[PDB]
Scaffold this active site. Sequence first.
Site, PDB file in Angstrom:
ATOM      1  N   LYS A  13       0.729  -1.193  -0.305  1.00  0.00           N
ATOM      2  CA  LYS A  13      -0.020   0.037  -0.149  1.00  0.00           C
ATOM      3  C   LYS A  13       0.902   1.217  -0.396  1.00  0.00           C
ATOM      4  O   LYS A  13       1.983   0.606   0.656  1.00  0.00           O
ATOM      5  CB  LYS A  13      -0.517  -0.557   1.251  1.00  0.00           C
ATOM      6  CG  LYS A  13      -1.927   0.724   0.820  1.00  0.00           C
ATOM      7  CD  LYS A  13      -2.047   2.418   1.983  1.00  0.00           C
ATOM      8  CE  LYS A  13      -3.600   2.797   2.074  1.00  0.00           C
ATOM      9  NZ  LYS A  13      -3.584   4.313   2.641  1.00  0.00           N
ATOM     10  N   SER A  66      -8.456   4.233   5.832  1.00  0.00           N
ATOM     11  CA  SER A  66      -8.599   2.803   4.411  1.00  0.00           C
ATOM     12  C   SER A  66      -8.338   2.413   4.434  1.00  0.00           C
ATOM     13  O   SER A  66      -8.733   1.314   3.257  1.00  0.00           O
ATOM     14  CB  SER A  66      -7.011   4.164   3.920  1.00  0.00           C
ATOM     15  OG  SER A  66      -5.962   2.955   3.845  1.00  0.00           O
ATOM     16  N   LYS A  76       4.498   3.224  -2.120  1.00  0.00           N
ATOM     17  CA  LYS A  76       4.848   5.068  -2.019  1.00  0.00           C
ATOM     18  C   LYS A  76       5.162   5.056  -3.329  1.00  0.00           C
ATOM     19  O   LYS A  76       5.798   4.428  -4.411  1.00  0.00           O
ATOM     20  CB  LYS A  76       5.860   5.762  -1.184  1.00  0.00           C
ATOM     21  CG  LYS A  76       4.926   7.190  -1.853  1.00  0.00           C
ATOM     22  CD  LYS A  76       4.284   7.756  -1.311  1.00  0.00           C
ATOM     23  CE  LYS A  76       3.723   8.074   0.014  1.00  0.00           C
ATOM     24  NZ  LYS A  76       3.002   8.590   0.068  1.00  0.00           N
ATOM     25  N   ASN A 110      -9.420  20.861   8.522  1.00  0.00           N
ATOM     26  CA  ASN A 110     -10.829  19.725   8.339  1.00  0.00           C
ATOM     27  C   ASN A 110     -10.112  19.082   9.982  1.00  0.00           C
ATOM     28  O   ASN A 110     -11.377  19.100  10.524  1.00  0.00           O
ATOM     29  CB  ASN A 110     -11.358  19.067   6.826  1.00  0.00           C
ATOM     30  CG  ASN A 110      -9.768  17.325   7.155  1.00  0.00           C
ATOM     31  OD1 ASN A 110      -8.654  17.965   7.676  1.00  0.00           O
ATOM     32  ND2 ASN A 110      -9.928  16.814   7.168  1.00  0.00           N
ATOM     33  N   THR A 166      -8.705  11.264  10.894  1.00  0.00           N
ATOM     34  CA  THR A 166      -7.868  11.619  11.737  1.00  0.00           C
ATOM     35  C   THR A 166      -8.234  12.350  12.828  1.00  0.00           C
ATOM     36  O   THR A 166      -7.643  12.211  14.137  1.00  0.00           O
ATOM     37  CB  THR A 166      -6.893  13.124  10.460  1.00  0.00           C
ATOM     38  OG1 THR A 166      -5.932  11.985   9.708  1.00  0.00           O
ATOM     39  CG2 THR A 166      -5.312  13.093  11.638  1.00  0.00           C
ATOM     40  N   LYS A 172       4.266   3.278   9.550  1.00  0.00           N
ATOM     41  CA  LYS A 172       2.881   3.830   9.809  1.00  0.00           C
ATOM     42  C   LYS A 172       1.865   1.781  10.291  1.00  0.00           C
ATOM     43  O   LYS A 172       1.225   1.734  10.614  1.00  0.00           O
ATOM     44  CB  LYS A 172       1.951   4.373   9.105  1.00  0.00           C
ATOM     45  CG  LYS A 172       2.262   5.354   9.313  1.00  0.00           C
ATOM     46  CD  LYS A 172       1.270   6.488   8.726  1.00  0.00           C
ATOM     47  CE  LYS A 172       1.092   8.185   9.278  1.00  0.00           C
ATOM     48  NZ  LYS A 172       2.413   8.579   8.753  1.00  0.00           N
TER      49      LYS A 172
END
EC number: 1.4.1.2
Lengths: 490, 117, 410, 410
Positions: free
Chosen positions: C66, C344, C102, C217, C186, C90
């Site tokens: 991913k 995700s 990535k 946000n 988040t 992560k």
Amino acid sequence: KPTGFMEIKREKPAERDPLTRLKDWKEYSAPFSEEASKRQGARCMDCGTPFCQIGADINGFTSGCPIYNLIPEWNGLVYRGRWKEALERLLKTNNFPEFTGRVCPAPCEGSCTLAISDPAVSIKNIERTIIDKGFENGWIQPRIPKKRTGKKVAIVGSGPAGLASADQLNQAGHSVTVFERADRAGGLLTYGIPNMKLEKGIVERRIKLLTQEGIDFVTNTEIGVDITADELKEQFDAVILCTGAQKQRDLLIEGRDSKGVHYAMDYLTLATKSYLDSNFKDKQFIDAKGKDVIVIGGGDTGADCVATALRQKAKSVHQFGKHPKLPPARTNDNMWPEQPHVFTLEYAYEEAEAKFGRDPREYSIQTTKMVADKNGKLKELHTIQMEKVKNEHGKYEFRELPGTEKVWPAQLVFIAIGFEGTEQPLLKQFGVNSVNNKISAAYGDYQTNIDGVFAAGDARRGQSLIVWAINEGREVAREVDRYLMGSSVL
Amino acid sequence: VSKYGKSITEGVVKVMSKMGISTVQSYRGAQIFEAVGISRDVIDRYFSGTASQLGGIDLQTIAEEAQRRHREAYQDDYSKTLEPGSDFQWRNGGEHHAFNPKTIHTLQWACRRNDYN
Amino acid sequence: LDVLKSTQTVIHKALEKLGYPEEVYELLKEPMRLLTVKIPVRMDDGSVKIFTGYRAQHNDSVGPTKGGIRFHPNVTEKEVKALSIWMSLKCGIIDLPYGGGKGGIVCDPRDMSFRELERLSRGYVRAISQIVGPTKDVPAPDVFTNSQIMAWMMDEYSRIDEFNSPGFITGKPLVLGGSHGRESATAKGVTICIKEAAKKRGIDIKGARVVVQGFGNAGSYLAKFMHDAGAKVVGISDAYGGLYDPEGLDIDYLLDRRDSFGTVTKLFNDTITNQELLELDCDILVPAAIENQITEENAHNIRAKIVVEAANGPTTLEGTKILSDRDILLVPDVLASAGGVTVSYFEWVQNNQGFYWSEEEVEEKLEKMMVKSFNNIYEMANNRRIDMRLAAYMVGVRKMAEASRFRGWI
Amino acid sequence: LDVLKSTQTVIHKALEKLGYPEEVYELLKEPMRLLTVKIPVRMDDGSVKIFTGYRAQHNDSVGPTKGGIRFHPNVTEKEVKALSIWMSLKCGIIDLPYGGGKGGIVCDPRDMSFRELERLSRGYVRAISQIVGPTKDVPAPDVFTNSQIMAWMMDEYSRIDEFNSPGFITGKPLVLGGSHGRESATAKGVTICIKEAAKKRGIDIKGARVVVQGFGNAGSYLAKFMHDAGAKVVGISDAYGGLYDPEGLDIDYLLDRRDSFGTVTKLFNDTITNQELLELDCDILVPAAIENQITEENAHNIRAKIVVEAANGPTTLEGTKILSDRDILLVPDVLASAGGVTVSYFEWVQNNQGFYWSEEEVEEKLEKMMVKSFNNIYEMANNRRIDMRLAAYMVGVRKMAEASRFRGWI
Ligand SMILES: Cc1cc2nc3c(=O)[nH]c(=O)nc-3n(C[C@H](O)[C@H](O)[C@H](O)COP(=O)(O)OP(=O)(O)OC[C@H]3O[C@@H](n4cnc5c(N)ncnc54)[C@H](O)[C@@H]3O)c2cc1C
Ligand code: SF4
Ligand code: SF4
């Protein structure tokens, strides 16, 4: 909220003591330190519509910096403490700061808004400090303009006007050549102005910078009998006539034939050349160590003559002048928009007063002279007093006092009562026309009768200052650039 | 950047308050300017609703002015400095002003001397 | 320039603390599959310019890889590899079946146009379609990337594979089969983490003083969640300044007046700079703004008991050391900002299952995962006398190294 | 260090001479797919060391890619890319359906053992099996690689794909499905090229004086073919010196006494160094020995009418310029040493067809291909006033660029 103009008192830099000023031929003053310079710069109040920049003839006397220095801008920058930016702004307009700062008599100081009943801001000293610090830090480096178009201008005369015009043309991108009679370039800056005011090391450094730019000076070329005007025109498109003004008026009075009477310009040139050659050991100059010295003709020339005689250690010196002694403050017929006429007491006079103990006096005014002595050398000089009186229609008149005849002992005498136009009719190879020995031209549009011939500097200005010469050089450079290539911003 | 944005917004609000329109949305459509020196034909073509008295310059003149400025600025082959402004202060060689030092001190001298010449 | 070396050094430190041999470090220092491709593209004027692509799979021992995709004009191989390792860390921290990766493209979305971006993304997928698939790779949204680009990528992979694969790519629009709460992930993650940190340190959440600098946000949703929970907000800041009120700030009114950008400062009122905002009294401080803010000068001025680095490395090593000496809990950013990755992952699971959950179910699952991960890392960091950043890195690398050892590559 | 830059410069020169835009240069300067992998391996002692792999596909617009594999301990990415471009140029010159490529592994076959090499190759294939297949890639023998490694690679690809794929990899043993004449391909190619060059320059092959320095398999087979054809050999050299006889040297006896290494010099007899050998009178000179031999000093001493660079860049730019000024035909190495690639292509075609040709058929097809290619390049080099090296590079790049333009990547 700037408040320096009232919360600060004007000061002066650290000057060498007068009693030791007479021994070493070096600069008699130094720039401000950092804190002092900041304090002095803070005085200027961001003056709107500044009167230090008008630079125009007012009532027959100049006022404001003629070359339009951005005085408020770089004063503010000096106060703020950013020096490279101030140097950049100064060099935007001025091209010879190292000469203007330590030579110019600073009409901007005399005439500005803050000069109303209060001491003016030291524009001259701030400028000198800026340029000196820039040179010491070595930020000034040759520009070396990359663009170049094959052309040819043959500036004549190495004076300040000639140098400024050559620098501007070289920056434009046109090759130039400077024709000079004297061994070293500079003109008045080399020989006329004394070592005291302008140590020749700075002049030589600037000329070396110009040579690095590529001016390519040529020395010992009087461009008269040596080189003909027709050949000069054929070999070079234009010619910027910075020919100078070195002819000095003479006193048509009997007795001025005996040996001893000398010209201020010739004497100063001889002394300066001797010093620059062998520290005046060649013994080809005029000596006055054991003799009296009298200078006729007040002004900068008289001051320089007095200083040179004092450094030569003459027994006695007296300065003579017809103009009555100036008042100690502003009078009714003098105002701050105009250059003041107050007592100045510049260098070379306080020093004479201090050193002379037997006769601690100077400025013997109200009498010039008449018929001198004879029989070889000068033994004595006669003098009579004159007073300014109104005649006809309230017009000033000079009438002598019959009962004030006096005798002074004088063995060497100098004459510096003024100057005339260029060296005409010696340089008649061109078709230029002169009115009073000065070549005819108007401020701007210097194109004279003959094509490619342009007046510049004192040649058309009569008698002026180095700042005036620089302004004339810049303007004639722009004019000739427009004449050749049509389009040129500056 | 934030301070500049806030100050510009405050200035816009002040300009709005000058006229009396209290909403940016209303002022946005509102045409509250008066051209001084623009031709009536040009105003009708592009600035319809704007008030103009003397007519004036034309599109060709505006284009010539813009081209002159652009060409000079992109030529600029002599120095690396911005010429001093003359909108709110007088600098020799800049934009002319009604009260130049010549006029100022001539008037003062004449008034103090009582001389007519 | 130093990102790759810093990542390698921290990985080496974590492996040394674990005590595994140097073979795991040798294998994990470098991504196992880096691909560089050139994407032809047609501009509006008809001219053709070639964009350089990138793709890196740090490891796939755990399972499918991913990673995001950034259209950043300064993307380079070193940055791509560093980001791949960071994403792998992560995933290891959150305990997901992902390995890490990535991608990126060297372009300028600013001067790029709409149809040109469409063609660029489509050419990118046509280029890298070979090594990308449901069991091999999974793109996701990132810098200069969003739902429209995700949808174009999904559409094209459907075209090339000849069958629908909604689970191929995450971060899709809701109608295309997206997951709810994609924007507040988040904020929810940081809310869970702050709640758990306060519980562990004994600070009562009820009446706790909170400061939230950076009101995008994330900041807006975090403030709303704190207000709903009960904790009072005593400071907000944005690009135009901030505010201060020890007895609340009417978060409901602030959110009601919230504009598109999140700017909230008044016009004719003075504001407080973030430098002085940091010094204001508060129990918990949440820097979610420009990086490199907490340094030596303000380390002695900070007063919050709990500091959560929702942003990416807002602090420095000196500030971390000073805070540790002062005994101020410091939440690693790796755990603070994992809500996006978690949501995700939930979206991918929903697509694979073919059935879509609801907001409440997503809320419950996300909070469960976050609390479990935070409790595990806190326990490990208290068992071993180390900093929480070191504990996070160590925990993240543990799973990857151990899975590699099982699979026998070493 | 300069190999990649030199390759890019020559490609740029060829493209400029062709007149195509800069887009083709932008696309062809860099290979389109470079993969770096790490191969776990188990040693005899039980310890595990990780070898770094490589693989580059310069282009695949024409069709399937091809490239060798070198177990050279100093293999790097720059060298791999340069070799990929060089192989693509070879394929373009020979007019094959290959695009070009190259692989490599960072290891030391010297200290490596038999079973360890087996495991190394097998791990390499397990690593890069994804982007390698009959229609995607085709390995081939190269430096530190031979039939046993080819056979292991074939066996493993059969295992992983679950079906036999003899055409997957070339250079296999004869029993496994190899092609006859795999060892004399270079000799046959140089024989055809020398024959055609002599025909074009008017030099009669019958009685032509020939010098062959470097007496490996290529030199031995070339000498045998020349003797069979009719041309007399008036010089041979090897690692131990050389000989000289203006009226033949009994090539039959020399080949009969040929040892494993190809050494032929006597024991108690003086020998001639290659430096003086080059100066000996001869019609055709064939440097197939150490590189950097023809330089400025010996350029004025060379006397052969035709020089064939069977080796890889044995000459230099100064020597090439001097020879061109002297009007000495210089055969580019790209065309001289393409016999190996041609025979590998024939082997691949035989495997794909499932039917195996014979020595005579291989001979005829190889000579036909070589003569056609040489005639085409000679015609182009005489049509355009350029050097034969420039003509070779230009012809090689023409096909690749034109195929890319058709396929529309640009
Ligand atoms: C503070 C101050 C003090 C001053 N002190 C003095 C002073 O003591 N004495 C003084 O005279 N002025 C003095 N001046 C005036 C000032 O020096 C001059 O006005 C100015 O510098 C001369 O400018 P210029 O460009 O003509 O230079 P110039 O030197 O006049 O330029 C002419 C140059 O060409 C040379 N030349 C002469 N004839 C020819 C020819 N036919 N062809 C070619 N070249 C020729 C000259 O030798 C000289 O080098 C002073 C000014 C100031 C502000
Ligand atoms: S050149 Fe003279 S008038 Fe001008 S600023 Fe300097 S000192 Fe003042
Ligand atoms: S010198 Fe006088 S006029 Fe010039 S800026 Fe200062 S105050 Fe204003």
